[PDB]
Amino acid sequence: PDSWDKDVYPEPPRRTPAPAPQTSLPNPVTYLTKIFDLLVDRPVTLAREFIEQQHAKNRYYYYHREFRRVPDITECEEKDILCMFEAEMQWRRDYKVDQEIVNIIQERLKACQQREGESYRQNCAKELEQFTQVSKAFQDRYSDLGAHYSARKCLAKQKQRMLAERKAAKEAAAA
Amino acid sequence: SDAPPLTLEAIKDRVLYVLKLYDKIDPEKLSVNSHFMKDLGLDSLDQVEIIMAMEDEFGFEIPDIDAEKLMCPQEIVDYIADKKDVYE
Amino acid sequence: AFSAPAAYLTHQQKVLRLYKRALRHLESWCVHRDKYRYFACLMRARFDEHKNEKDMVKATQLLRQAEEEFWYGQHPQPYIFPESPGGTSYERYECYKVPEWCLDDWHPSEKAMYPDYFAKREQWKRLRRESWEREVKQLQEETPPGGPRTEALPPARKEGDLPPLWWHIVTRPRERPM
Amino acid sequence: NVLQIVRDHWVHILVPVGFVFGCYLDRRSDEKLTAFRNKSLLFKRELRPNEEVTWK
Amino acid sequence: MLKIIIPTTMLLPMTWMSKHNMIWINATVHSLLISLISLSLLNQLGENSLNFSLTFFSDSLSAPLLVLTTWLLPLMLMASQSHLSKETTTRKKLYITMLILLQLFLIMTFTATELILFYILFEATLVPTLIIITRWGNQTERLNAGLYFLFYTLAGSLPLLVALVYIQNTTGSLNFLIIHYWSHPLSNSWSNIFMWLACIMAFMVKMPLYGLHLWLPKAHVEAPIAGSMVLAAVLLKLGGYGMMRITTILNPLTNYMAYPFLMLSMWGMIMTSSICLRQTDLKSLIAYSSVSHMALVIVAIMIQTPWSFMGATALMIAHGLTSSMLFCLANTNYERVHSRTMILARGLQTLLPLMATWWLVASLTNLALPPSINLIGELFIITASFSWSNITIILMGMNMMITALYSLYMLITTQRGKYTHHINNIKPSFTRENALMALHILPLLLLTLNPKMILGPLY
Amino acid sequence: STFVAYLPDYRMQEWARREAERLVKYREANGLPLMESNCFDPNKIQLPEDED
Amino acid sequence: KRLFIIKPSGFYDRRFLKLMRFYILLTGIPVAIGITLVNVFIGEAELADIPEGYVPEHWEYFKHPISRW
Ligand SMILES: CCCCCCCCCCCCCCCCCC(=O)OC[C@H](COP(=O)([O-])OCC(O)COP(=O)([O-])OC[C@@H](COC(=O)CCCCCCCCCCCCCCCCC)OC(=O)CCCCCCCCCCCCCCCCC)OC(=O)CCCCCCCCCCCCCCCCC
Ligand SMILES: CCCCCCCCCCCCCCCCC[C@@H](O)O[C@H](CO[C@H](O)CCCCCCCCCCCCCCC)COP(=O)(O)OCC[N+](C)(C)C
Ligand SMILES: CCCCCCCCCCCCCCCCC[C@@H](O)O[C@H](CO[C@H](O)CCCCCCCCCCCCCCC)COP(=O)(O)OCC[N+](C)(C)C
Ligand SMILES: CCCCCCCC/C=C\CCCCCCCC(=O)O[C@H](COC(=O)CCCCCCC/C=C/CCCCCCCC)COP(=O)(O)OCCN
Ligand SMILES: CCCCCCCCCCCC(=O)SCCNC(=O)CCNC(=O)[C@H](O)C(C)(C)COP(=O)(O)O
Catalogue all structural domains in chain B, each as residue range(s) with its CATH number.
Answer: 8-84 (1.10.1200.10)
Q: Rounded to 5 degrees, what angle do the CA atoms E206, E212, E215 make?
A: 70
Which amino acid residue places its CA nearest to atom 48 of ligand 4? E191
Of the candidates E46, E178, E180, the beta carbon closest to that of A96 is on E46
3-state secondary structure C38-99: HHHHHHHHHHHCCCCCCCHHHHHHHHHHHHHHHHHHCCCCCCCCCCCCCCCCCCCCHHHCCC
Report the alpha-carbon distance of residue A151 to residue A103 in Å, rounded: 22
Chain E residues touching G16 at Cβ < 8 A: 354, 429, 431, 434-435
Torsion of CA A99, A105, A110, A113, to 10 degrees: -160
Q: Going by beta carbons, is chain D in contact with chain A, meaning 3 or more pairs sit under 8 Å apart?
A: yes
Chain G contacts to C (CB-CB under 8 A)? 4-12
User: Nearest chain F Cα to E449, which residue?
Assistant: F5
Structure determination technique employed: cryo-EM
Chains that touch B (3 or more CB pairs under 8 A): C
F2 touches chain E (CB under 8 A): no
Report the alpha-carbon distance of residue G59 to residue G57 in Å, rounded: 6
Short-list C58, B87, G37, F12, CA closest to A89? F12
A168 touches chain E (CB under 8 A): no
> What distance lies between CA E296 and its chain's CA centroid?
14
Chain E residues touching D16 at Cβ < 8 A: 7
Q: Do E421 and C91 touch (CB under 8 A)?
A: no
Which amino acid residue places its CA nearest to atom 59 of ligand 1? A43
Q: Going by beta carbons, is chain F in contact with chain B, meaning 3 or more pairs sit under 8 Å apart?
A: no
> What distance lies between CA B26 and its chain's CA centroid?
15
Q: Do A167 and F51 touch (CB under 8 A)?
A: yes
Please report the sign of the dihedral spanned by the C-alpha atoms of residue C83, residue C89, residue C90, residue C94: negative
Which amino acid residue places its CA nearest to atom 29 of ligand 1? G39
- Asked whether the beta carbons of E113 and E176 are under 8 A apart, the reply is yes
Which amino acid residue places its CA nearest to atom 27 of ligand 3? F1
DSSP structural state of residue A39? I
- Asked whether the beta carbons of E416 and E337 are under 8 A apart, the reply is no
3-state secondary structure E224-259: CHHHHHHHHHHHCHHHHHHHHHHHHHHCCCHHHHCH
Mutate to test the interface with A, among E47, E60, E248, E251 (most CBs of A within 10 A): E47
B60 touches chain C (CB under 8 A): yes
Backbone Cα Rg of chain A: 27
Torsion of CA A2, A6, A10, A15, to 10 degrees: 50
Residues composing chain C: 178
Helices marked H in B1-88 — which ranges?
A: 8-20, 44-58, 64-69, 73-84
Which helix (H) or strand (E) segment holds residue A171: the answer is helix A151-173
> What distance lies between CA E295 and its chain's CA centroid?
13
Question: Which atom, in ligand 3's list, is nearest to the CA of E442?
Answer: 31
Chains that touch D (3 or more CB pairs under 8 A): A, E
E45 touches chain F (CB under 8 A): yes
Q: State how far the alpha carbon of C151 is from the alpha carbons of C1, C5, C146, C165, in Å.
A: 12, 8, 14, 12
Q: Do G6 and C117 touch (CB under 8 A)?
A: no
Indicate which residues of B carry an active-site annotation: 43
Chain A residues touching F24 at Cβ < 8 A: 8, 101, 104-105
- Asked whether the beta carbons of E374 and E449 are under 8 A apart, the reply is no
Q: How far is C106 from chain E (nearest CA, A)?
A: 9
